[PDB]
Curated annotation (Swiss-Prot), chain A:
The organism of origin for this protein: Mycoplasma pneumoniae (strain ATCC 29342 / M129 / Subtype 1)
UniProtKB keywords: Ribonucleoprotein, Ribosomal protein
GO cellular component terms, A-Z: cytosolic small ribosomal subunit
Covered residues, full protein: 19 to 258 of 294
GO BP terms, alphabetized: translation
GO molecular function: structural constituent of ribosome
Domain of life: Bacteria
Protein's UniProt name: Small ribosomal subunit protein uS2
Family indicated by similarity: Belongs to the universal ribosomal protein uS2 family.
Protein's gene: rpsB
Curated annotation (Swiss-Prot), chain B:
Species name: Mycoplasma pneumoniae (strain ATCC 29342 / M129 / Subtype 1) (Mycoplasmoides pneumoniae)
Residues of the full protein shown: 3 to 217 of 273
The protein's name: Small ribosomal subunit protein uS3
Keyword rRNA-binding found: yes
GO terms under cellular component: cytosolic small ribosomal subunit
One Gene Ontology term from the biological process aspect of the record: translation
Function per UniProt: Binds the lower part of the 30S subunit head. Binds mRNA in the 70S ribosome, positioning it for translation.
GO molecular function: mRNA binding; rRNA binding; structural constituent of ribosome
Protein family: Belongs to the universal ribosomal protein uS3 family.
All copies of domain KH type-2, residue ranges: 38-108
Record bears the keyword rRNA processing: no
Keywords carried by this UniProt record: Ribonucleoprotein, Ribosomal protein, RNA-binding, rRNA-binding
Subunit structure: Part of the 30S ribosomal subunit. Forms a tight complex with proteins S10 and S14.
Curated annotation (Swiss-Prot), chain C:
Function, as annotated: With S4 and S12 plays an important role in translational accuracy. Located at the back of the 30S subunit body where it stabilizes the conformation of the head with respect to the body.
Cystine pairs: none
Similarity-based family: Belongs to the universal ribosomal protein uS5 family.
Protein's name according to its UniProt entry: Small ribosomal subunit protein uS5
Source organism per UniProt: Mycoplasma pneumoniae (strain ATCC 29342 / M129 / Subtype 1)
Domains as described in the record: The N-terminal domain interacts with the head of the 30S subunit; the C-terminal domain interacts with the body and contacts protein S4. The interaction surface between S4 and S5 is involved in control of translational fidelity.
Residues in S5 DRBM domain copies: 1-64
One GO term (biological process): translation
GO cellular component, one term: small ribosomal subunit
Record note on quaternary structure: Part of the 30S ribosomal subunit. Contacts proteins S4 and S8.
Keywords: Ribonucleoprotein, Ribosomal protein, RNA-binding, rRNA-binding
GO molecular function: rRNA binding; structural constituent of ribosome
Amino acid sequence: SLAKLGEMRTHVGMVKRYWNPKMGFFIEPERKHNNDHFVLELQRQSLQTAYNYVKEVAQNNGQILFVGTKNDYVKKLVNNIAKRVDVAFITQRWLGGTLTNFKTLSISINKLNKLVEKQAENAADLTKKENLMLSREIERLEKFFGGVKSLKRLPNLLIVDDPVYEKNAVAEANILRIPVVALCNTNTNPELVDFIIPANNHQPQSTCLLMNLLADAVAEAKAMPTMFAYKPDEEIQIEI
Amino acid sequence: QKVNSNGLRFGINKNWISRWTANSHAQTAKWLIEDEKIRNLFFVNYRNAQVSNVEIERTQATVDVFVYAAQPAFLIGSENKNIQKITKQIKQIIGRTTNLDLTINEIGSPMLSARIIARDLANAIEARVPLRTAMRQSLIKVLKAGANGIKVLVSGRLNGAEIARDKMYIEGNMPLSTLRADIDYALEKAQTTYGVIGVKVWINRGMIYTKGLNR
Amino acid sequence: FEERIVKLKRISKTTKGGRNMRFSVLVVVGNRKGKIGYGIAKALEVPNAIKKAIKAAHNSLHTIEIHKGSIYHEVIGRSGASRVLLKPAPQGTGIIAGGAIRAIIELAGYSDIYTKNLGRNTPINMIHATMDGILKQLSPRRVAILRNKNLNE
RNA sequence: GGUGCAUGGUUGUCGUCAGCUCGUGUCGUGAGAUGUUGGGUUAAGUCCCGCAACGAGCGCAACCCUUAUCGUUAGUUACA
RNA sequence: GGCGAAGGCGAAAACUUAGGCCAUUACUGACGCUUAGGCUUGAAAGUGUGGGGAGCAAAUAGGAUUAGAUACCCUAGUAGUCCACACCGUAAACGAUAGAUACUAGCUGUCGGGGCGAUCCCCUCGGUAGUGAAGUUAACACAUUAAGUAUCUCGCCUGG
RNA sequence: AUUGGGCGUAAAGCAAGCGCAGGCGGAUUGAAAAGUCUGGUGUUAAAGGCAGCUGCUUAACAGUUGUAUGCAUUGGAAAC
């Protein structure tokens, strides 16, 4: 299949009493108790639209920057995506200053490359504090710039666990003219995505199946095998 | 308030522009008064060659002069006339019987000495070149030679009585406190029809390290 | 692109001893085919600020269509309690304004305008309101497609 | 001989401080902010972490001498 | 928290009664709307009129202190604060946001009313609040109770 | 500031409530058509002006033509 409705089984409900009303236009008529439940058919339609749209964008020799910044679950599974499909991954969101100022990513990636070279070229003269400085510089420039740590190419598309979760992601997204697609919740402002994906992320199955479907969409545009919507089994893994 | 660690840099981290040993404490004053005239005359008389520095040694009324320049071709000149003029001038300025031997050597990135930099910057300022463009010319002069970061200041008068309007350039790693830094600082007092103007340049010969002793 | 300066003024802040003597500049760029934009810059010298504001303006190009040699429709551009009137002035008078407004209109691709200012004489909100009014003009085909009736209106 | 508000150079006050400046760009409708800030952590913007931020530079430490144990070097007019 | 037209309403107890909140194709069938003029009310000082005056402080007066205290300290201390009457009818009576009218994301609170039901939760509508969307003030910010949206009427408004 | 502006802090909502002069009004329908359009005529002057021409050397100037311009008197319409 392709973006099967079988995955659309637990994409309902989040933290209540906090929700953007304009999501009720895009999700469903939500009760006074802030019922964060999502519809199935409209969510599936929008998810399939995003799927094949990012597929056709990545078939144009583009890039889908996979961003993972939630507690541990989204980040770990985005790293699994990166090790499954050749796409960039986020351990920690870049603090801003990547796209509109291209020099600021180039300096970081070059610094990390030279840091790796220095770590692999000399370790006898270094002291414990000097080695800690070197490792901390590596860690800093890897987390101060997650999507740009060894590559200089400008991403042609980026996702995020929540388009209101990351200010820098939105800034470097709206800097470019790209179809930004993101996992959107009820507490999220819908005005920061191209195709809204109204679905849950507090439920771990929901978000992991969603971003795995995104991984399959980018992989089928990269001519490599795809697993979800092609295997009927839904993943069961609690949100680490 | 405004000091550069160059006296300690020159002498225990580098050499002097005029170094010589002696056993008496009386002829030192005479030698130091005598050699400065030769140094100043050689600097002012030869700016087409951009004479970077002159080393003077003085022992028992025995004066020897060495010259390092950014453009030593003008020191020799066409058909080797300027070299003869320089040799006779230096031989006569040190004494009728004072010995003299000279060799011509060059330095990497020849326009790295702040002396000629400040002199040429003042010349550009007073040579139909606006102050901003003269600043840029001095910056290129230090930069196109192959030198490191640049500090350029021009203080004094704008033909007025105001002290709250000027421009100044800082570009790169210039530690005012690092002893082992190889920094050259020079000043020129230029006479304009409204006063004297100080043109100061701090130029890095290169961010030197592991070389902190005299050579 | 002409990259012409339109406004310079010295802006200063209070810091630990002394004030921030420095004059800022602001350039309007255009191509007279419709593209126009503006950009501000700060520097301590004339040419550096000129070039920085030139590049900042040239980073912003907003195209606008031609009607009667002027803007598409009458609009009173408002910004910061400042209003500047822009109209589809018929070509019977020419560009009648000061040098700044004449240049702003010319880099907008328009030949003439009837100017009208509302509010304070401070210039930065004059520029903001003028730019807002100029850029917010309408188009026939766009409003046709947006509306239920879509041929040209 | 003054005109140091004509100045060059010169040092000192705060204070050798605990911070400072600058670019990229972002956020403001402009003054401006950002980073450069803040939690841990220092004499220090010392670094980490987080944050439209990213870094470049300056001040304290940094080479320098000065300082101490040992090993060692040449050998008197030393030591012995 | 509610109400009262603002002025305001708190030891309790009763009465007259303005007015209120909830839902009524329910009835006249526009009877409407405001408001220059016009009607009434209007904190309070302080005025005199009759009592008591518990207490105190304008004023006044001593000791300080001060460059000097009838300023900040206090003691003595009247008008007055108290009440009955008028008049004073001004207030930071300003939300420096008019009255009548209808509409504009939400969200989290409260009170009152209607339904319901261990309580309750809940829904309805108002009142009473806010962050904030949109919208609107240069800006500060308001924002379903607007400074948002719009109709009728009036008052205020052009340099110190 | 109808054209062509405000009333929270850079004029500011009347001190509060009620009201007329005066002002405007919810829906349907009919009379009437003042408001409304419409059909016209009279006159609103030649000189003046808009468009046009002539001559004064050329307009300055002078002359000149279609045209202005506001009332009354006239067939209707029902949308309020």
